[PDB]
Each structure stands twice: as C-alpha cells, then as structure tokens.
Design a protein around this ligand. Structure first.
Ligand SMILES: CCOc1cccc([C@@H]2CC(=O)Nc3c2c(C)nn3-c2ccc3nncn3n2)c1
Length: 1119
C-alpha cells in the first residue's frame, strides 16, 4: 500500500454541461444557472450582462438541473440529480452578505438492478409540481412525489413497456401528470403518452394515441398553454402532436446537420431556438390557429436560419434578444439576436466569449519563453471549434517604457490639469527628496511643480477636493491650488516634529507623528485640524480609504501599531477604538488597507515578513471578522489599489508581486510575472492609458497588465479537430495531428465544409457527427512555436486515420523525425487490419517522407524507447530498431493484450494500457533482445490513459471517471499488480504528462492531466507520514463542512464502476484540503483539536492551526 497520492485541480472544468433560467435568488431576479460538471454557477441577468452571485461545488457530477416552484414557495427551488443518483432540492438563502444554499430534501435514488439508458439520465418535473420523473434505466420510470412530507425523496418505480426511450417530457395543460416520449422498437420510432397515477403508482392510458415518427426523432418539446401538446425534432422533420391533431414539416434547411438542442424564447411557446452541430442557430415559429371555443391550435410551423454560434450543448434565451450559448466543444458565448440582418445576412452578433479548454484530447508541456517556466499546449475542442490552447501561470505585464532611475521610495499619479480627465504627472519619492516627472505623450521628463517641495521626502501626493493638490512630506502637509499652482495652506505638527506616516483621500488626511495622530479636513485654501490623539504605541501604518456609499468620506481610520502588532479600527473624528486585532509575533505591520471586492468590505494588513492578514470589515460598527492569513513573499508587502477592466483590485509589491482580487466572494491571490517590485501606482495618461508604473531598486517601468486571473490562455483557432501534439525543439515547432470532415458525392470526390488549418498551410504535401456521406481527412500539421502559424500540412491517404505521433531521434541517426502511426478504416471491420508507421523529416519548410512501414493493424500509441521505436498495434506491442538504411525493423513483440491502446515507458519498463484488461508491466531485456511480462492488473478496467509515477507505481484512468494506482506485490504471485490506490475523480482523463506550470517539500513528482470537460489536474506523491496527516485533516474537514444536498465526501470519492464500488484509498483530495484556507476560525479550531502529526519516524507532535495553514499554503503552490 506504500503508494500515497495527492490530486488537485489546476483548472476547473470549463465545458458547459447544462443551463437553466428562472427566479432562484429572488422572485424578481432573472437567473442563469450553469452546470460545469460538479460546479453550479449562479448569475443574475442584467442590462450590463451576467452578474456572478454564487458558485457552488457539489460532491457529484450534475446530471439533472431544473428549477421549479411549488405552491406556497415565494421563489424557485432547484432540483439536482448527480451521476451517482444523489437527489436534492435546494433553496437560495441570502442574509446580508452571507449566501447559503440550503438542502430542503435529499436522498439517493439508485436501484439495485438496471441498465443505464443509451440517451442517459433524464429528469423532468411536472408543470404543476406534482412529481419529479426520472428515466435512469431501460424499462423503468421513477417517480418522486412532491408532498411536503417527502424530505427523503422517497420514490417508486413504474414498469415502462417501451424499453428504448429516446426522450421524454411532462406535458402542459393536463388534468393529470402526463408524459410524452419517443421510443424505438423493431417497427421504428414512435411518440406515445401516459398519465401518471400517484394513487395507483402506475401509468394510465395517455390523452392521445401513439404515432409513428421519423427514424431519427431525437428530442421532445412540451409546448406551454395555449398550444399544449408536443413538438418532436428529427434530422429531416419537425412534428407537432396534440391528439386529434398532427402537423409535420420537412424543411430542407435543417437536413445538413443534426439539431442537438432547443430552448423556448416566448413563455407561450410561439418561438423556440434550435442549434445544430455546425453551430447553426434557427428560430422555430409556431403559427396560431383560432377556434370558436377559444382554444388555440397550431396552423403552421416555420424554421428560419438566424446565423452561427459556437456548437451548442445548450441554449438559453435571456430576454431582450440576448442568448447564452453553452458549449462543450468550443467557447461559450453571449450573443445578441437582431431584428435586422448584417452585411453577410446574419441576425446573430457575438457579444461575449467564454474560454472552454474542453475537450482536451492531448497536451504537452514546453518551456516556450523562459527556461524553467513550463506552459501547457493543448489539443482542444472539436470540428469548427478545434484549437490549440497555450496555458501559463501568472499575470503578465507589457512593458511600454523603461527608465534607469535608482532609489525610488514611492510613486503617485496626479492630474495637473483640472480640466483633463487623465493623469499627466508622476511624482517620485527618494530618501530625503521628491522629483516630478511630466508625461507628454510617450515622453517622460523631469520638471518642477510649483507648490510642491523637492527637498523633502513625499509620503503622499494627489488630487484632492476643491480643485487642489496635496503633498505630504516628512516636514509638512502642503495644499496647493490648481490654477495657479500656489501654496494655499500648510499644516505642521505644533513643534514642527517630523511626520512619520501619512494617509489621505480626496477630503481627509490622517498623519502620524510617532505615537500621535492628527486628522485634517481639506477645505478651500484650508487644511483644517479636526482632532488628534496619542496611541498606546508607535504608529506603523495608516489607511482612510472610503468604502461603500460614503461620498468619498471615511468614518473609519485603520491603523497598525508597533509593539502589540495590532490592527485597529478607529472612529473619526474621536479616534474611539472600535476594534483591535493582535496579529502575533514581533514583526510590525507595514501596510494596511480598507478595501471593497464584489461589494464586500475587507481589512488587509501586511507584515514585514510577507504575511498578509485579511478580515471581513463591517463599515458601520468597525467589527473585524473571520481572520485569514496568506504569505505573499518573505519581504515587506506594500498594497495599492488599481483599476483594470472596470474592477478595483489590490497590487501587492514584494519579492513575489501579487494581485489580490475576488472570485465567488472570496479573496484570491495570483502571481504577477515580474521580478521584485518595490513600488507601484496606477497611471492613466494620454501616452500611457490604463497603465501601471512600477519601480525596483534601479528602474522605473510603465506597462499595462493582462487580465486578472490565475492562468493566462492563448487560443490558436484551427477550425478542425486536433487529435495529438508533440514538440520538436530542434525545429522550434509542434507537430499536430488533425482531422477535418469532408462530404462525399455520388462520384469519386469529397469536399471540405470550410477552410481550416490543414487547407491553409504555407506549404502542403500528400501521401500517394458534424453533418447528417461524411469522411474524415487526416493531416500532420507543422506549427511554429512562436507565431503558431501553420507552416506545413501533410495529408494522409483516403480512409487513413492518424492515431499516434512522436518526435524523436533513433539509433545512430542524428536527425530528429516526426513519426506518425495510422489505421486504415473500413466500415465492415470490427477493428482495423491495416495501418502504417511513417517517418517524416521537417527540413526547409517542408515535410519529407524518410521511411514507411506497413503493419497489419491500428498503430494506437508510439513512444521513443532507448533509441528505438515502441509501438502498440492492435493486440501487439512491438519494438522497432532504426537501421543504417533508415528503415524500421522489428526487434521483438508482445502478444498478450486485447487492444494495446496506451504506452508509457521509464528505463527498460513499459506500462501498457488495454481496452478492457487494465494495465500491464513489461520489461525490455537488453541481453535477450525480447520483452518479459513482469506483472499485470488482473482486475478488468476500461482504460482511457496511463502514466508511470515511478519504477514501482503505475497510474491509471478509466472510462467510469476513476483513477487507480497499481504496485508490484509486497511465488509467481509477483505476476499480480495490486490496486493499492483508488479514487473517483469524476472527470474523463484523455492524457497524462509529466511536468509543471510552476517555476522550477510535502509532495514529490508532478503529473498533469487533461479531461473532456477541459479540467486540468495534478497528481503528486506523498510519504506515508504526510498522507496520514492529510487523511486525518480530510476526515475532520468532512465533519465540519456542510455539503450541498447532504452528500458525503467519502461517497463521492468512492471508486465506482459497473463491477466494483469501494472507498477511496491512497488518494488525498487536494481540492478538499485546500478548502481548509476558506473555512471559519471556529471550524478551523474544530479541525485541529488534538490533531497530531508524525515527523518522519515515530515521534508524534501537536499540529497547530498556524502550522497547518503553512502546510496548506505550501500545497497550493504546486499548481
Ligand atoms: C511545508 C511546510 O510545512 C510546515 C510549516 C510549518 C510547520 C510545520 C510543522 C512542523 C514540521 O516541521 N513538520 C510538520 C508540521 C506539520 C503540521 N506537519 N508536519 C509534518 C507532517 C508529516 C511529516 N512527514 N515528515 C515530516 N512531516 N512533518 C510544517
């Protein structure tokens, strides 16, 4: 069992798996809810756009997500079902700034027997909220009655005679709850209804008889009153049914591509949006026919093409012509629908684009810029959405000026013009001195500013009330008129003692002299002394940033003190103590700041040692709450607000410059990708708009900052599907396997749907579902590592699929090659019986074929192996040598596989991942020239990816979203690999690769993985003693953290396939561990009660809160 692993999220899933609108946060709000695997994102729809309210993680994959409103509820409730059959009903509760998702009802609805249906879990709710219906398995329909008594969500099953249901909905306008569904039997596809009897717990005959529908009828729409009835969407037809009523259309406009989603635009069902696999967006329009009895029937159906979106998993109309396009295969979007078409005749205009990395089908890590700074390059998306994505940690700065100028001690922007809205002045402090720089476009020049002194050190200067400037120095506070620039007022301490600390806003000043504080107000031509006090200790730092709807005025003074290392909130003008916090230690506070993020207020206080304490701040009572602490460096941190893209954030200067910001109403910290920064200020001038001034010991820089986020993503559109990637350092390029769909005609020809990377390369060579006829045409792309231009595309043979790709040298040949493994794909073949290995050389802008090898199967995987080429081909693993004639030649073979899909190697060891029989360990035996089977995992697993952790530890991912770790057994029972680690990840892993995105203690090793949902994860190793500590922490965390839907963490992480359910073992959930930094202090104290740790050999010692914070902080830095 001596494998201990830790798995943590580096990038949360980005794919959208579902989306609903309604009134969840309040009756009056319009909400958009988005499901991204295990995450629920809640937004309020505004004219501004989407306002984020709350993101809630759940301990499950979200399979069903629907809003509904029982009689007596003031706003919508939310029904969630997870993939592990956890059902819950949730309520949004907001009290002040505290947001809580409360569980109204919960229970697990898994049955002991059943076959999961082809078109998946379906969950539907009756319009009248009488019941929830679940299609979990073939032949069964599960009913959860919605009585107020049913808090355990007890359910009953009804036998469903139709075994193969495609889609199902509850109908509107029905006296009894009534389902309408499409099902398939040997006689074709059919639409049918049943009423659902709560009394009989059984179906009753439906209100209208069944009809035959199109062979590819796939979606049921329940149309609201006054239409009622159902619309059935197929590939070639749309039909409406309401009993003594049938209407069908066969509009040719839809036949080109499968329609995969729908959404109702109007409450009464007059219009619907439809989306297809080529991102076409249609409007479906229902024309009313009146009747004498006042009912409405359907006169006609029409479909109109509006334009193109991302390929939509889901569409949600948000009012006022705005649509959310939720994409699994490309970026999500907000689009606007216009009444009038544009130039090319589209009614659709993209408003906003949201990054989706998924699916990540392959990836690699390259130090693209600096040595030691790995970046992840993914094969992302599919079809027209396909892309490369380049992911890197930290926030970049774009330097636009650099001036040699040592000894800077402070920076302040100033508008010397009272008319101009932009800064035109940068003021610098030095020891004992001040200098003023004017900004004329890009020119930066020394200048004097009348009223300001140059022979004292400035602690603050800026624009202030009544069209005035202020300069606060060690000697005095100077107030200066704007026109002309004259000294209009000067404040000094009564005996002209030095000012030691300064804080200022537009209308208020607070200065310290040693222990003394003075509060001044800025009036026309007057610095007015209001009040003063003597602090118990010397003053270390001050802030009076006004917060909230305060009209630029602060009733509060934040202060840090020497000696007791206190952060205090004082009232102005009295200086009455509202709150005191002792921060501990013997290192003084250096920087203190009152701040607002996402409409919450905080106090930030940084010590000389790199520690940052932060608290919730009540701006009415002065109360500080829920202390947290991070570490931002080993030097003093200086804090300063700036604005980028209409949000205020805080820049933290230290040896590790950082931006502090908010996400999901919690503070976040992201590294800035710069060396040590001592000082900074925002600067918005004509020549340097929306910019930052930065200083170190020697230099002043002016630049702009990138988006404020943990990870930067660059996108390279390919407009076709990338499949595999490898890096070739000697060529300074990537090789990328890609495929594009073409459409075949009745003769000998196929045609592309659009230009894409493989059709738009600089040069090209050849060898000698998206649509509803289709063929995949595969290519090797050569892409420049700097410009990501497509330099060359090589096209493979007709019906040749490119499966594997490696860049390597072989044998005694100094050249580096791109090598590709393929399969010839024919329709009748269960698996391929033919493939090739092709060795290419990239020289002088083109790919040349150096050698080919015909093999009798699909070449699924290839790896460089000790100067030889290792390949898996159908059920065979084969080692090839590169001969003097530049030909591949078989050395040895292994045959004991079903389908050898995945290879990794380490030394002479080979890890083989099979379609259905898990993993196998081979050794190449150099003195025999053959393989030896060392051990295999005799537990069947349907593999998706493999990795070697070390000589003794083998990591697998399988199709049911689990990880496992195999080891050799601690006889020829040595032939049995032991599954010593098990963990339900809840993602589908396509790729593992050794590497790190962090610039290169508790953990060893770094394995990244990429998933279908665009999630990037990390696996690393732990010692026994570190594992035990972290397991104990998990157990304690799980007793204090309330889970949404009352799902147990242990249940969620349990290994779960069709053959085996077991508790997780040998795996720490780093996402859970990291949440230790987000819990309250009471909870934190609870976790730590009598918690001990082993030190590495025997001795057990107490684990303190503060030491555990440091532990978890270290852990966050591994990604
Ligand atoms: C990376 C930053 O970590 C630490 C930072 C500060 C203090 C500690 C304290 C003391 C210390 O030196 N060790 C320690 C601690 C705590 C809680 N756990 N812990 C273990 C646990 C398992 C283990 N296995 N080998 C060695 N250890 N040390 C840690």
């Amino acid at each position: 069992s001596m494998s201990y692993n830790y798995v943590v999220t580096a990038q949360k899933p980005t794919a959208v798996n579902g989306c609903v609108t309604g009134h969840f946060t309040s009756a009056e709000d319009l909400n958009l809810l988005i499901a991204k695997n295990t995450r629920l994102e809640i937004y309020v729809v505004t004219a501004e756009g989407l306002r984020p309210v709350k993101e809630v993680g759940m301990y499950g994959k979200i399979a069903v997500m629907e809003l509904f409103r029982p009689k007596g509820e003031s706003k919508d409730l939310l029904f969630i079902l997870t993939a592990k059959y956890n059902a819950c009903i949730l309520e949004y509760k907001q009290s002040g700034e505290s947001i809580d998702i409360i569980t109204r009802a919960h229970g697990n609805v898994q049955d002991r027997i059943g076959r999961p249906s082809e078109t998946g879990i379906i969950g539907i709710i009756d319009p009248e909220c009488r019941m929830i219906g679940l299609r979990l398995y073939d032949g069964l329909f599960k009913v959860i009655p919605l009585d107020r008594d049913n808090k355990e969500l007890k359910a009953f099953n009804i036998r469903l005679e139709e075994l193969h249901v495609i889609d199902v909905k509850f109908l509107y306008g029905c006296q009894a709850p009534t389902i309408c569904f499409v099902y398939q039997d040997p006689q074709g596809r059919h639409v049918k209804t049943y009423e659902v009897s709560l009394r009989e717990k059984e179906f009753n005959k439906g209100p209208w008889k069944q009809e035959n529908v199109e062979a590819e009828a796939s979606m049921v729409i329940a149309v609201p009153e006054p239409f009622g009835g159902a619309i059935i969407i197929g590939q070639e037809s749309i039909t409406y049914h309401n009993g003594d009523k049938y209407l069908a259309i066969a509009p040719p406009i839809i036949k080109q591509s499968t329609i995969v989603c729908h959404n109702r635009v109007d409450p009464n069902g007059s219009r619907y949006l439809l989306g297809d696999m080529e991102g076409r967006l249609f409007m479906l329009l229902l024309e009313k026919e009146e009747q004498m009895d006042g009912t409405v029937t359907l006169k006609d159906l029409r479909v109109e093409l509006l334009g193109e979106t991302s390929i939509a998993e889901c569409l949600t109309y948000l009012d006022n012509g705005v649509v959310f396009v939720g994409s699994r295969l490309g970026d999500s979007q907000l689009v606007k629908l216009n009444v009038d078409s544009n130039e090319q005749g589209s009614y659709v205009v993209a408003m906003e684009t949201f990054t989706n990395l998924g699916p990540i089908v392959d990836m690699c890590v390259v130090d693209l810029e600096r040595q030691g700074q790995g970046q992840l390059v993914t094969c992302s998306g599919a079809f027209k959405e396909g892309s490369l994505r380049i992911i890197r940690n930290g926030i970049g700065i774009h330097e636009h000026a650099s001036i040699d100028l040592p000894g800077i001690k402070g920076l302040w922007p100033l508008r010397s013009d009272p008319q101009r809205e932009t800064d035109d002045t940068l003021v610098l402090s030095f020891v004992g001195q001040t200098r003023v720089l004017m900004l004329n476009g890009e020119e930066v020049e020394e200048t004097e500013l009348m009223g300001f002194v140059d022979d004292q050190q400035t602690f603050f200067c800026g624009n202030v009330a009544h069209q005035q400037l202020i300069q606060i120095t060690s000697a005095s506070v100077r107030l200066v008129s704007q026109e002309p620039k004259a000294l209009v007022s000067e404040w000094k301490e009564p005996q002209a003692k030095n000012i030691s600390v300064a804080s200022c806003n537009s209308s208020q000043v607070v200065v310290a002299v040693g222990r003394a504080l003075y509060y001044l107000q800025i009036h026309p031509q007057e610095l007015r002394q209001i009040s003063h006090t003597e602090m118990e200790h010397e003053v270390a730092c001050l802030d009076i940033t006004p917060l909230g709807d305060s009209n630029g005025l602060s009733p509060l003074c934040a202060i840090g003190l020497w000696t007791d290392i206190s952060a205090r909130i004082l009232k102005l003008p009295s200086f009455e103590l509202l709150h005191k916090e002792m921060l501990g230690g013997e290192i003084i506070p250096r920087s203190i700041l009152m701040t607002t993020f996402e409409s919450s207020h905080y106090l930030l206080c940084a010590l000389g040692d790199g520690a940052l304490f932060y608290f919730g701040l009540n701006i009415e009572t002065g109360l500080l709450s829920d202390r947290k602490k991070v570490t931002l460096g080993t030097q003093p941190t200086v804090l300063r607000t700036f604005r980028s893209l209409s949000t205020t954030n805080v820049f933290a200067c230290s040896d590790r410059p950082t931006v502090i910001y908010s996400s999901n109403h919690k503070l976040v910290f992201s590294n800035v990708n710069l060396k040590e920064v001592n000082y900074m200020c925002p600067l918005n001038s004509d020549g340097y708009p929306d910019s930052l001034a930065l200083a170190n010991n020697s230099t002043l820089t002016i630049g702009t900052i990138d988006e404020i986020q943990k990870l930067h993503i660059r996108t390279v559109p390919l407009y076709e599907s990338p499949r595999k990637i490898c890096y070739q350092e000697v060529s300074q390029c990537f090789g990328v396997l890609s495929s594009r769909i073409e459409v075949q005609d009745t003769s000998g020809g196929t045609t592309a749907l659009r230009p894409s990377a493989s059709t738009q390369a600089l040069s090209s060579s050849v060898s000698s579902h998206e649509t509803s006829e289709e063929v995949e045409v595969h290519n090797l792309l050569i892409i420049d590592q700097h410009t990501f231009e497509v330099l060359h595309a090589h096209q493979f043979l007709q019906n040749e699929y490119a499966l594997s790709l490696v860049s390597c040298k072989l044998g005694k040949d100094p050249n580096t090659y791109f090598i590709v493994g393929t399969a010839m794909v024919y329709p009748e073949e269960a698996e391929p019986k033919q493939g090739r290995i092709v060795v290419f050389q990239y020289s002088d802008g083109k790919l040349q074929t150096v050698a080919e090898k015909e093999v009798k199967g699909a070449v699924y995987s290839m790896v460089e192996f000790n100067g030889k080429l290792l390949a898996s081909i159908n059920s065979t693993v084969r080692l090839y040598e590169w001969t003097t004639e530049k030909e591949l030649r078989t050395e040895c073979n292994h045959y004991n596989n079903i389908m050898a899909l995945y290879l990794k190697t380490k030394g002479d060891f080979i890890l083989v991942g099979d379609l259905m029989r898990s993993v196998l360990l081979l050794a190449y035996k150099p003195m025999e020239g053959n393989f030896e089977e060392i051990a295999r995992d005799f537990n069947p697993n349907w593999m998706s990816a493999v990795e070697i952790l070390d000589d003794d530890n083998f990591l697998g991912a399988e199709n049911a979203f689990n990880l496992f770790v195999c080891q050799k057994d601690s006889d020829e029972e040595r032939q049995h690999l032991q599954e010593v680690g098990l963990f339900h990840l809840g993602e589908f892993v396509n790729v593992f690769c050794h590497g790190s995105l962090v610039m290169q203690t508790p953990t060893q090793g770094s394995v990244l993985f990429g998933t279908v949902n665009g999630m990037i994860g990390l696996v690393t190793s732990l010692s026994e003693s570190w594992y035990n500590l972290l397991l104990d922490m998990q157990n304690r965390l799980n007793k204090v953290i309330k889970s949404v839907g009352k799902i147990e963490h242990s249940f969620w992480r349990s290994f779960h396939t069709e053959r085996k359910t077991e508790p997780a073992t040998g795996f720490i959930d780093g996402d859970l561990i990291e949440s230790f930094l987000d819990i309250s202090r009471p909870k934190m104290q609870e976790v730590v009660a009598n918690l001990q740790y082993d030190d590495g050999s025997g001795m057990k010692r107490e684990a303190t809160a503060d030491d555990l914070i440091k532990v978890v902080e270290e852990l966050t830095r591994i990604h």
